[PDB]
Amino acid sequence: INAPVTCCYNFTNRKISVQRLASYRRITSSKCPKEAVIFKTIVAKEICADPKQKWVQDSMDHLDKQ
Amino acid sequence: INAPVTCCYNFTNRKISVQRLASYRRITSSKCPKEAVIFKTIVAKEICADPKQKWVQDSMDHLDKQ
Ligand SMILES: [K+]
Numbered sequence: 001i002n003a004p005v006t007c008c009y010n011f012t013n014r015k016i017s018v019q020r021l022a023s024y025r026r027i028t029s030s031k032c033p034k035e036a037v038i039f040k041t042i043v044a045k046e047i048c049a050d051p052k053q054k055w056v057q058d059s060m061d062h063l064d065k066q
Numbered sequence: 067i068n069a070p071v072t073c074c075y076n077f078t079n080r081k082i083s084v085q086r087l088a089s090y091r092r093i094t095s096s097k098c099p100k101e102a103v104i105f106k107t108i109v110a111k112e113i114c115a116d117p118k119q120k121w122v123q124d125s126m127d128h129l130d131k132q
């Protein structure tokens with residue numbers, strides 16, 4: 001209710017090295033234009049990424065393990 | 067550009083104990099309806115709070131120190 005609302009309005013066009021990534025979360029809220037991934041870098045930078053892209057899915061798999 | 071956009075659309079009506087708070091950040095973006103505080107709890111819960119309220123300002127001061 002008093003939770004913040006986070007959405008992604010664009011998706012990155014570059015592959016982020018698995019070396020630069022710390023975590024991610026998914027956006028699934030219907031308040032947003034679409035479903036998204038937000039990667040967080042080892043410098044705590046937040047980048048919107050397309051959940052349908054293979055590199056994005058691979059990086060989340062990597063982070064789920066490594 | 068591919069940074070996520072976070073806004074607060076409501077503000078909490080209760081004072082959160084300084085004991086339950088871990089951090090906060092400010093929302094200042096013009097993409098949002100107004101300026102906000104998002105407190106994060108010691109359970110990693112995120113709560114929107116009115117920056118103009120004294121208890122909110124006091125809690126940020128506490129977190130800046132303690
Ligand atoms: K794009």
Ligand SMILES: [K+]
Pocket residue numbers: 076077078079
């Ligand atoms: K309120």
